[PDB]
Amino acid sequence: GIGGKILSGLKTALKGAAKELASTYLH
């Protein structure tokens, strides 16, 4: 169950929030 705590920070920061923040520039 631990992955749904840790990756919900780490992957969300890496390519959720830093997809949207970077979205104009990279897409």
From Swiss-Prot:
It comes from the Eukaryota. This is Maximin-3. The chain holds residues 44 to 70 of 144 of the full protein.
